[PDB]
Amino acid sequence: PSPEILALRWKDTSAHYSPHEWVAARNVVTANKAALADYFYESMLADPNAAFFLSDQLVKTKLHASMQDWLESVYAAAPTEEYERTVAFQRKVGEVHARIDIPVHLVTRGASALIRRICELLDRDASLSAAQAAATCRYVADVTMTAVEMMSHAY
């Protein structure tokens, strides 16, 4: 399924939501990416299965500073109309993960932790009505699980 075909799936997903949701989310996620990357990394030390794959020094440069640009790839695609660029990024990361038999259930695990944590930021952000913080959190979960689905194409 080429990135022309898989673009339209990202687009049609993002189109369930207003521009206000797209940007709202994007702003919160760039505002706190490095902090959201730390929280991710720590979450999968806590998991021993996942900790096996982290030799406690590989993140120093790679995993912390990379998880950042993932968060930008994902949350900008829609407000930029740059879908096939983003979708392409996801297959690379999916293929990287699959090459080293990183079990897919742990990715879905991580997708879920981020979603709970990004919504927690949306919640604690006082510059929004709870109606808005709600609708953004929805978008967040949808696009994460859209991305993860595509990351999962390499199995």
Q: What is the dihedral of CA 143, 145, 150, 154, to 10 degrees?
A: 160
Contact indicator for 110, 40 with CB cutoff of 8 Å: yes
Report the residue from 24, 44, 122, 150 that binds ligand HEM according to the rule CB under 6 A.
Answer: 44
CB of 79 to a second copy, least distance (A): 21
Closest residue by Cα to residue 88 from 102, 107, 104, 74: 74
Cβ contacts of 4 within 8 Å, gap of 6 or more: 84
32 binds ligand HEM (CB under 6 A): no
CB of 146 to a second copy, least distance (A): 7
100 binds a second copy (CB under 8 A): no
* Residue 64, marked binder: no
140 binds ligand HEM (CB under 6 A): no
Residues 13-32, interacting with a second copy (CB under 8 A): 13, 16
The three-state secondary structure class of 57 is coil
Which residue numbers belong to the known binding site?
9, 62, 97, 123, 153
